[PDB]
Each structure stands twice: as C-alpha cells, then as structure tokens.
Amino acid sequence: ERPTFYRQELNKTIWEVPERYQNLSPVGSGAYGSVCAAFDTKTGLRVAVKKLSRPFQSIIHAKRTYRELRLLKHMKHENVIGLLDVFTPARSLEEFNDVYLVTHLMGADLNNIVKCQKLTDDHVQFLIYQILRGLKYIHSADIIHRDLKPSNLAVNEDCELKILDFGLARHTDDEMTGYVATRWYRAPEIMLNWMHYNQTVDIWSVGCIMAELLTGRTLFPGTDHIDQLKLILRLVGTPGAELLKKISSESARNYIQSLTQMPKMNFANVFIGANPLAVDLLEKMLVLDSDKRITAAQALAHAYFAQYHDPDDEPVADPYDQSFESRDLLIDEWKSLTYDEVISFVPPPLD
Numbered sequence: 001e002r003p004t005f006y007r008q009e010l011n012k013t014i015w016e017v018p019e020r021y022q023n024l025s026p027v028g029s030g031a032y033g034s035v036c037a038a039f040d041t042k043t044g045l046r047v048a049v050k051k052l053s054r055p056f057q058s059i060i061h062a063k064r065t066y067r068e069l070r071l072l073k074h075m076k077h078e079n080v081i082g083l084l085d086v087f088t089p090a091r092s093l094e095e096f097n098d099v100y101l102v103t104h105l106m107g108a109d110l111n112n113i114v115k116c117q118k119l120t121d122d123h124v125q126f127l128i129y130q131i132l133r134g135l136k137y138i139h140s141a142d143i144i145h146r147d148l149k150p151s152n153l154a155v156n157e158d159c160e161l162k163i164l165d166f167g168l169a170r171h172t173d174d175e176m177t178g179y180v181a182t183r184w185y186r187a188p189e190i191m192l193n194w195m196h197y198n199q200t201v202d203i204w205s206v207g208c209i210m211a212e213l214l215t216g217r218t219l220f221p222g223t224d225h226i227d228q229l230k231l232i233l234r235l236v237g238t239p240g241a242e243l244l245k246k247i248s249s250e251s252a253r254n255y256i257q258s259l260t261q262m263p264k265m266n267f268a269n270v271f272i273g274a275n276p277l278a279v280d281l282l283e284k285m286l287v288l289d290s291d292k293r294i295t296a297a298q299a300l301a302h303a304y305f306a307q308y309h310d311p312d313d314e315p316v317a318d319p320y321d322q323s324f325e326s327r328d329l330l331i332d333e334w335k336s337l338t339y340d341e342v343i344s345f346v347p348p349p350l351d
C-alpha cells in the first residue's frame, strides 16, 4: 500500500525507514553498505537493515545491486540468508535512489564459535551438516557462493547456521594479498585462476572449515598466493596429467610443472584422533581435481551425518533465472529493474 517512513540521522548517514522498524542502532558500516540493528514491530524479530550506499553510481554497482536483490529475493531455506523485506523512501522511479534490505539479525559468526578451541565431533557434524544442506539448496539453483568462510556463516546460541555474504556481488581485489583469512578458504583453481571454476569450489571451502572446527587451527594459512598453494599441494599432492590437461594458462601448467611432485598425505596422520568418518569425508572434499570433488548432495548422504541426514528434509531451490548476467543494460535500465524488484517484493509469511 505504502507505509509511513520516518527520517533520522545516524552516524552522519540519513536513514529514512518505515515506522515498523524501531530503535535503529548502528552495527557496522562497510564500503558495500551501512548496517543497523533494529526491532521490527511487525514480525517481532530483531533485524539487520542494510542501506546500500550508492547503488547506481555505475553500471557495475547498479548491476551488483540488482544482482544482490534478485539473489536475496530467491533464497528461501532455513540455512541460507533470507530477505524479510526491501524498501525505498522514493514514491516514484524518478526519485528512486536508495535501497534498504532487511533480514534476521544474526548475532555471532562461526569465528566466534571456534575461536576458543576445537569443538566436539558432534558439533562439527551438526554445523557442517547445515552448511551442506543450505549449499545443496544454493547449488540446486545453479548458484556458486564463491566466498564461504567462518565469517560468512552466522551461528546462533543453539548452533543453528545460515549461509550469507554470497560471493556473487563483490570483486575480491587487493584483499586476497598476503597472510589474509579471506584467501585461506579458496580452492586453488580459483585462487590462481587455473581454469573456469564450478560449484565444487564451495565444497573445497567447506572442507577447509570442517578441518578447522576439528583441529581448531586454520588448514592452509598461506602468507601469500604461492605459499598457500604450496601448503595445499603438500597435503593433497601435486597435480597429475589428468588435472594438468584441464588448466588453461600455459603459464600455470608451466609453473605447476616446475614443482617437485608430491604424493597425497595420510589425512589420518594429519587429523590425529578425529572420527574416521570425518577424515574420510575430508579426503572426499579436499580433492585437487574439482571434477572429482564430492557434491553437497552426495556429502549429505555420507555416513558422517547419519544422525542428521534426511533426504526428505533437505530441499532444493526453485529454478533461478540468471540470464540477466549476459544482459547489457545502462545504469538506468538496471535501476528500473531493481525498482521493479523492490516494488514487487512479497514478504515471507509468518504465523
């Protein structure tokens, strides 16, 4: 219909939001967008309201914005970030210039939870089961997260987990240099752009996380791109001819071929004392050849999640049309598409 908005400045940022959102409290403003915690009188939930800064200041930003709303609008799974609401103070496409997105306020991320030490195998089972369940859903819609890491997994007081911060959007630049956590979870093939990557890059990420939850230590904390690849090949062994034939860059193949060949290590001797089913699963996730990596759907069926696996309660997504990525529009055409999606949004029904 059209709710009543109320203007108000916070941390020198103007927030014009509907009255249903109350007690707006700054909670960290990144370059991507300003964030606020608030209470949503209509759902009863404490929420996170992100105000995108300059959503249409460029064709790429304008397309990123569009991409993010389309993405958040489609995601409907217990283990994936959902869109509770999206809105703009603008009454016309003419003045339409700001985008706000609302979602359940997630308290702590996976870091907080592991930071203190390794957890019980039972908790490792639960947490990883949830990441794979949401990932099965995400992949089913032909989507690739691209940036799975502890800080992008929100965990609640009962160890319930939601996946967020989809890669699809940002363009990891100069942020992957040096001894940085952001890169420690990337599959090698995408890290050194050996080839055009698939969804198993996400499975590689889960394996890195699973190992860290078991040992309480980062698996491949390389000090740079090369040191990290070296840490990965020491564990997984160097590429074989089969894999090498799949790396595009004649330079990457050349480089790889300059490295003394190494055999795969014994994971049992790496993850000492870990449940054998866990080790077996890690060996299936941490495979150099991405074509041979295990899938989310397959992993769920692995005997490591016997206590949680239920094929009937592990949904897939509705088909997700991403043809707009090959679309060539102008800022304004992206803007209007964004606006149509803002205007068309239908809220998730609560009881």
Ligand SMILES: Fc1ccc(-c2ncn(CC3CC3)c2-c2ccncc2)cc1
Pocket (backbone or CB within 6 Å): 027, 028, 030, 035, 048, 049, 050, 083, 101, 102, 103, 104, 105, 106, 107, 164, 165
């Ligand atoms: F609609 C959205 C979508 C994504 C984010 C959102 N984007 C990033 N983060 C993580 C922290 C840095 C804010 C969130 C977030 C913050 C608090 N609670 C849950 C999610 C916020 C609102």
